[PDB]
Amino acid sequence: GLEAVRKRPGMYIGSTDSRGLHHLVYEIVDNAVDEALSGYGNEINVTIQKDNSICVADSGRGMPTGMHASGIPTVEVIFTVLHHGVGASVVNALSKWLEVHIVRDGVEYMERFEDGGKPVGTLKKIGKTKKRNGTSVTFLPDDTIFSTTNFSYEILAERLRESAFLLKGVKITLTDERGEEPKEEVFHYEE
Ligand SMILES: CCc1[nH]c2nc(Sc3cccnc3)nc(OC)c2c1C=O
């Protein structure tokens, strides 16, 4: 279960200091680049929000909104079961809250999780939008778990540039809004 992650997060993300904190960002990001390398998205946006929560947003197909063979939505399986989206449930387990916003085929979806991965209600259709297809994940890391919940902008920029090195024609932006004015870096290549 997700309790195993909270009991021994070191066996899942290496440590719960600054290193482990930033690792949470990379887990969600890698799912976006997986999608980019599959298809399927010309930009990945990473935003450090004012409340020290992280948003990771892509322009991919959008996380599947249908029922999983186990009898709960595929969105929920990805974020609540370990054992597509490796690391997503780990991030969910170690966050105070997390929500996923999905836009698929002109309809927008959302689901919220709290207290280490407990679903708040269920997956919901919000209503039709003109927005492009994509998945957006916001989460606030659990401060009772991490030694520090204070994201380094420099560390994120260096590692996202590295993730951009992997990619052709997809643009990775980092935004810090903590932060009286929106500070940001952009990386894109090329061939
Ligand atoms: C914003 C980060 C993110 N973005 C994502 N986009 C897709 S899109 C997709 C992938 C496979 C099958 N169908 C849709 N799927 C995902 O999980 C499987 C994610 C995902 C998971 O964290």
149 within 8 A of 143, measured Cβ to Cβ: yes
Q: Which residue out of 135, 138, 160, 173 has the highest number of ligand 1 atoms within 8 Å of its CB and is therefore the one to mutate?
A: 135
CA of 35 to the centre of ligand 1 (A): 6
Residue 47, C-beta contacts closer than 8 angstroms, at least 6 positions apart: 54, 55, 56, 57, 174, 175, 176, 177
Number of compact structural domains in the chain: 1
CA of 181 to the centre of ligand 1 (A): 30
Taking CA atoms only, the protein residue closest to ligand 1 atom 17 is 85
Domain range enclosing 177: 1-191
8 within 8 A of 16, measured Cβ to Cβ: no
Instruction: Give rounded-to-5 percent helix, strand, coil for the chain.
Output: 30, 30, 40
| Residue 65's CATH number | 3.30.565.10
Indicate whether residue 78 lines ligand 1 (CB < 6 A). yes
CA of 102 to the centre of ligand 1 (A): 9
Q: What angle in degrees, to the nearest 10, is found between the helix axes of 18-38 and 153-165?
A: 30
